[PDB]
Amino acid sequence: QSNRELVVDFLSYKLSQKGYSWSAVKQALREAGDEFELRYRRLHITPGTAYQSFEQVVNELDGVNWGRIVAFFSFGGALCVESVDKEMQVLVSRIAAWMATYLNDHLEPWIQENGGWDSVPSQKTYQGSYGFRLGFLHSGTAKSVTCTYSPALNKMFCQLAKTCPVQLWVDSTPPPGTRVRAMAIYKQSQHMTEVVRRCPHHERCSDSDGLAPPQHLIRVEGNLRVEYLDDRNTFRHSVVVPYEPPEVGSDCTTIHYNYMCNSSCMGGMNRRPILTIITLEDSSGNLLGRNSFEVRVCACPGRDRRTEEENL
Ligand SMILES: [Zn+2]
């Protein structure tokens, strides 16, 4: 229980390589941890679903060898960095605690027996040089609310075709010509290759604003400069608007998104969970920053969020 020095130092080292401070046989793990990274690749994380993502990934890697321990320590390193990227700093100390309770029960008893000292759009969060973060109104879960967001799940519940305000926060103002793109993908791995689109009923219902194509799940409300993309090679849908600096006195910019199809719609999402990816891009289309959040479109956003959070 004092291998804590290994976890508390190895993770703080991977935070050093990215610019974060924590706030013998130590060298040995960093070289392997590093040497494993340049030769590798390397699953969503929320403050509530945090221990779940640790039970799953660590149990899924089937005889413990000297190679998986690096792969496990290195796994906890990316987790703490991505947790801070997602503006979820709280999980860093929690991850070290879980990294201290798995090796103590499952992984070490193998080491004392040895004792030797020698197609799919990515969803990784990047805040980028402009400090790009997402903000949400804290609207509670009373039965009458159009849209609500759950921080414990980083999940937004909204009613169909209702204003979903999403805030863009930046440390510095991106140059003119900057654009903001929204895109939905399926959350589960088995469906991530499938394009999220509207179901036949809502696709052919008289709801068009005259700007969005009838097959697009996500629309932007109140913006004549809105642009809709059906990708030439991935066939994925996205919607982009020009970024505007915050209003007079404000310090965030608010896009009004609409979700035009319900989560349980047969022929569409068919009760499958989706994520919405917001990217900041310049005029030439280079990526400046990316954040994502799960979305569910339902009839009563209030009751569904409270029902989900009461499970935590
Ligand atoms: Zn539908």
Q: Give the chain as a 3 state SS string.
A: CCCHHHHHHHHHHHHHCCCCCCCCCCHHHHHHHHHHHCCCCCCCCCCCCHHHHHHHHHHCCCCCCHHHHHHHHHHHHHHHHHHHHCCCCCHHHHHHHHHHHHHHHHHHHHCCCCCCCCCCCCCCCECCCCCCEEEECCCCCCCCCCEEEECCCCEEEECCCCCEEEEEECCCCCCCCCEEEEEEEECCHHHCCCCCCCCHHHHCCCCCCCCCCCCCCEEECCCCCCEEEECCCCCCEEEEEECCCCCCCCCCEEEEEEECCCCCCCCCCCCCCEEEEEEEECCCCCEEEEEEEEEEECCCHHHHHHHHHCCC
Q: Which residues pair with 287 in a beta bridge?
A: 281
- Per-domain boundaries in the chain: 3-113, 132-311
Report the candidate in 167, 149, 181 with the shortest Cα–Cα distance to residue 295. Answer: 149
Confirm or deny that 191 is annotated as ligand binding.
no
Report the candidate in 308, 220, 295 with the shortest Cα–Cα distance to residue 257. Answer: 220
Q: Would you say 136 and 147 are in contact if contact means Cβ atoms under 8 Å apart?
A: no
Confirm or deny that 300 is annotated as ligand binding.
no
Long-range pairs for 200-207: beta carbons < 8 A, 24 or more residues apart? 200/267, 201/265, 201/267, 202/160, 202/260, 202/261, 202/262, 202/265, 202/268, 207/161, 207/260
Report the candidate in 127, 102, 132 with the shortest Cα–Cα distance to residue 3. Answer: 102
CATH of 132-311, one of 3.30.1180.10, 2.60.40.1180, 2.60.15.10, 2.60.40.720: 2.60.40.720
CA of 217 to the centre of ligand 1 (A): 9
Confirm or deny that 199 is annotated as ligand binding.
yes
**What Å distances lie between residue 186 and 110, 189, 192, 269, 296, CA to CA?**
38, 8, 5, 8, 11
CA of 162 to the centre of ligand 1 (A): 14
CA of 297 to the centre of ligand 1 (A): 10
> Most distant CA pair in the chain: distance in Å?
70
Superfamily of segment(s) 3-113:
Blc2-like (1.10.437.10)
Resolution value, angstrom units:
2.5
**What Å distances lie between residue 117 and 112, 114, 296, CA to CA?**
11, 9, 49
CA of 277 to the centre of ligand 1 (A): 20
Confirm or deny that 261 is annotated as ligand binding.
yes
